[model samples]
Target: DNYIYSTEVGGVGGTPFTFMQETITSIKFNWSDQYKLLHHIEVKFINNANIYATGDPKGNHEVILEIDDDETIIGSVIGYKKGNDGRCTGVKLTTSKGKSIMAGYFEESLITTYTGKLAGIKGGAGSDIDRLGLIFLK
Candidate 1:
């Protein structure tokens, strides 16, 4: 066609990242470029739905999911813990691409988790607070 960079791949979607502390979480795809890391990923139950992630903090972070509504895929974030700087809460992360959740810190800025899984996240709910939608299957 018009020669630029004919790219359209999957294992995940595109332009729908909303997390962090900074956005995008986990990657390592070999199609349209994906090498991720966002403190390993964190976001727990809400309803903000429609989210995306991509990170290359250098530790194999490849996370991507999409759901407009009716999300009931609970359980992720094997374990993690922090407070200052990383600001993470207290209890988190694991491995195998589907366990390494559990996080905290929202009043300090953001990063609420404990098993609810990434999505929008605003505030108020416990488990650290700050959550909107909720979707990110594994």
Candidate 2:
């Protein structure tokens, strides 16, 4: 169980949810009105289990990014927060094979997680994605 959790970033709102288990396979994001803020997120693992952190679902668009099997695993995540204590606005996930997937507005300075094999995610959600965090396998 060599799991390492990165420090949480963003606002402290809504209920918190953590999904830590086997290797991550894909990620789904629900964008808020006009595709500005993150409304919901779902993480799927290799074990066929999924965990979700949801908020307002009305007038939202869903985007899915899948990690190719040849990519091996996720490495680290680059996150963009709204403010010092605001909701998460965007994310960029890079895989072990150097492939990357990004979504949403990426304003302000970015925060990246400790480098390792990303296995899970943890955060809080309300009308928007309140917080963002990453789980790494060392």
Candidate 3:
């Protein structure tokens, strides 16, 4: 069987990618097959850095971008609790485009037993923090 690979680049680690001052003019995903042309994702810059953080939380922060079938943007918040002792936890589909969607807290330990939809597709509910950190795949 054949497979396709994608890449996401140039974004702040703990901040929202769409909130960056520099606009994302293009996105290219290279595949393994030679006949398959790279997928080009493009966006127009109507505005720059439209998103801002209203509060601060202590932890190892991470972000996930989930795109729906209609190409709607869903942002997930993945972070570890402060003091560096507890496991990582976060909320799925917490933001969209550049706005907040879900507002609350999620415990990573409790999330382990959860099984539902995380973002676009089905199967998981909570953030795939382990695989996400390993492959860096959104």
Candidate 4:
């Protein structure tokens, strides 16, 4: 289990936020090699703990968790917004066989109802000001 890719918010400005290493509860995988589809399969965030930030751009923050082929946790992105909205951060995932997947951009508000599908695929148009993380299938 090793991570394939990762991103964060350290050099942008403000105080550095750290990833909640213990906040990762579980990860389930649902992959289709023939169709080139891969999902969190199933991901669970740490409950009862403040793994996320809730505030304005200058203090808004969140964490990025990366998953690898062997299932190893790799890199991460601890981002903080400097304005009213957060940064998009983009999508990140690969095929069941380890092929690179396309990433899209969209608005931050879209996260509440995002269904990551672009022309029938997983990646969709997203905004750079939106918070970043794994997209929900349903």
Please estimate how well model 3 matches the true structure, expressed as its whole-model Cα lDDT: 0.24
Query: Which runs of model 2 end up more than 4 angstroms from their true locations?
Result: 33-35, 49-53, 68-77, 82-85
Report every candidate's CA lDDT.
Answer: 0.27, 0.69, 0.24, 0.27
lDDT of 3 by residue, 18-52 (tens): 21221222211111122111111112222432332
Tens-digit per-residue lDDT, 77-103, candidate 2: 445565546777777766677777666
Off by over 4 Å in 4: 1-11, 26-49, 54-88, 94-138
Query: Given candidate 4, what's the lDDT at residue 119?
Result: 10
Question: Which is superior by lDDT, 2 or 4?
Answer: 2
Q: Please give the distance, in angstroms, between residue 18's alpha carbon in candidate 1 and its true position after superposition.
A: 7.0
Clash count for candidate 3 is 1
Residue 100 lDDT in candidate 3:
40
Q: What TM-score does prediction 3 earn?
A: 0.22
- After superposing candidate 1 on the true structure, give the runs of residues whose Cα lies further than 4 Å from its correct spot: 1-57, 76-78, 87-119, 122-138
The TM-score, computed over Cα atoms with residue i paired to residue i, of candidate 1 is: 0.26
Off by over 4 Å in 3: 1-67, 72-74, 82-85, 92-138
Candidate 2 steric clashes: 0
Top-down lDDT ranking: 2, 4, 1, 3
